[PDB]
């Protein structure tokens, strides 16, 4: 008998930007960007805070694409506090420098 699994179709347009979700209040941003380092060099590292608090979420970039993917899995699973780094590539990246004038 001989079987074996194959298929790495890892080929994908120049992704680096990563999507992190489900960052336990007691993550930040360095933790994040500190937990990204070990695969591979970053540009631009910060999590979403409402002012006080952390949002859920944050964004990671690498020098090259290649590096980046790796994370998304080596990460995508992996438990620091409670909940796991929900880690996936951002298709498209949303750029809308704007707020609620309210307080």
Not at 58 to 79: D, H, L, Q, W, Y
């Amino acid at each position: 008998g001989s079987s074996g699994s194959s298929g790495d179709r890892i080929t994908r347009y120049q992704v680096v930007n990563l999507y992190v979700k489900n960052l336990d209040d007691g993550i930040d941003d360095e933790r994040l960007r500190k937990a990204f380092s070990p695969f591979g060099t970053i540009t631009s590292a910060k999590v979403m805070m409402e002012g006080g608090r952390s949002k859920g979420f944050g964004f990671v970039c690498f020098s090259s694409p290649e590096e980046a993917t790796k994370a998304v899995t080596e990460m995508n699973g992996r438990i620091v506090a409670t909940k796991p780094l929900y880690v996936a590539l951002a298709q498209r990246k949303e750029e809308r420098q704007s707020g609620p004038s309210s307080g």
